[PDB]
Amino acid sequence: AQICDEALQYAARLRELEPGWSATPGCQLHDAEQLWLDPLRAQTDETFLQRRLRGDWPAEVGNRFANWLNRAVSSDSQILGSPEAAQWSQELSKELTMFKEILEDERD
């Protein structure tokens, strides 16, 4: 839970940055996460990207973060054989369900 808390905290200090840093030019700038990285670009663009975050409601990004969280687990076959991986997947699914629900109502 603490890790996803820090993710929100990271997004929290991403509220302290420029309003339109996500609209800068670049070949690769993680545009899948950019709807949640910069919430203030909806003030910058009236209809180019303001309606995109409202219509899309980006909550799958934490699943990508869950993939990064899948790099936080040990590569042990004993956990996968036993129900330890089942409990890990259950608590991971619950906490990223909470994270996706947090990321869903960012428009209010």
Partner: protein, 306 residues
């Protein structure tokens, strides 16, 4: 001691030179008693005229900077000082080591009373904000946000929600407002159960040693670090009686001769800094006074937390 009918969010407040020495044993973030006393001073100054009561404060602490330095060759730190004026003979006065800290905190205030039905929410919110913009929070002046880009008004949210989902959405929006910070809560139950765990580990262990063990980094031999549930800071938990409650005119050189004085000793407890999304309701974060004046014990805590 009561459930708040509304929650008033005082926004990012930049306290300039707050008292970094919170306690005789701890330094850093100031005492929660300073915040509860500030809210009671706000109720004393502008709360009565608005026919409302202001009890309970939730601290978020969006930014902390300590006016400290690390001398070379030492792993500890020292406090940067201020040059006091000279004496009447032109000599330097004796230095009292006082530390300062630049804070940026936002406060959740519990509002209950009939005046919430007598005024608009933004009116009483703006009145308590413009009262708080000329006060002090821990010994430091409050920077009232002049000539920046976008100033932040309050958002008084009524806790008497019509529906559970609307109340939940209001609490989540209010948590989203105070996002880059950490709610500071009281952990008497956690400190007591850790004291019982240490007493099972080793007898005649005081609460001071259990408080110390919850703050130092314990290194265990096979060399790993013994983990902690949270941040687990040592906070000043209140004041205990050190003398009988004397008469208002009895104590010489008191602040006023109408308030009774009693000499006290600092009470030390365990506090925890959490991300504010890890709470059921934001009214759990409110710091309440609790006097119990017959037995000393002038505490501040977070009741109705868990």
């Amino acid at each position: 001691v009561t459930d708040p009918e509304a929650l008033l969010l005082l926004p990012r407040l930049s306290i300039q030179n707050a008292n970094a020495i919170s306690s005789p044993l701890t330094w850093g973030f100031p005492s929660p008693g300073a915040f509860t006393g500030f809210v009671h001073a706000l109720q004393r100054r502008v709360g009565i005229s608005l026919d409302i009561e202001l009890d309970g404060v939730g601290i978020v602490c969006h930014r902390f900077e300590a006016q400290i330095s690390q001398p070379a060759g030492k792993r500890t730190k020292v406090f940067n000082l201020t040059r006091n004026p000279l004496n009447r003979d032109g000599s330097t006065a004796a230095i009292v080591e006082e530390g300062r800290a630049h804070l940026e905190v936002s406060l959740l205030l519990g509002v209950h009373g009939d005046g919430l039905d007598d005024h608009p929410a933004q009116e009483i919110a703006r009145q308590v904000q413009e009262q708080a913009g000329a006060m002090r929070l821990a010994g430091g002046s409050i920077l009232p946000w002049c000539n920046e880009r976008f100033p932040a008004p309050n958002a008084e949210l009524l806790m008497l929600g019509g529906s559970d989902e609307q109340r939940r959405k209001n609490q989540r929006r209010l948590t989203r407002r105070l996002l880059p910070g950490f709610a500071l809560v009281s952990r008497e139950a956690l400190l007591q159960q850790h004291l019982e765990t240490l007493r099972t580990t080793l007898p005649e262990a005081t609460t001071l040693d259990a408080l110390l063990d919850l703050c130092r980094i314990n290194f265990e031999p096979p060399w790993q670090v013994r983990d902690k549930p949270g941040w687990l800071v040592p906070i000043p938990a209140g004041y205990n009686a050190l003398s009988p409650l004397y008469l208002p005119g009895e104590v010489r050189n008191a602040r006023d001769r109408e308030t009774p004085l009693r000499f006290v000793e600092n009470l030390f407890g365990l506090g925890e800094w959490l991300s504010p999304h890890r709470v059921a309701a934001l009214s759990d974060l409110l710091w309440y006074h609790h006097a119990e004046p017959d037995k000393g014990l002038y505490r501040w805590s977070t009741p109705r937390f868990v």
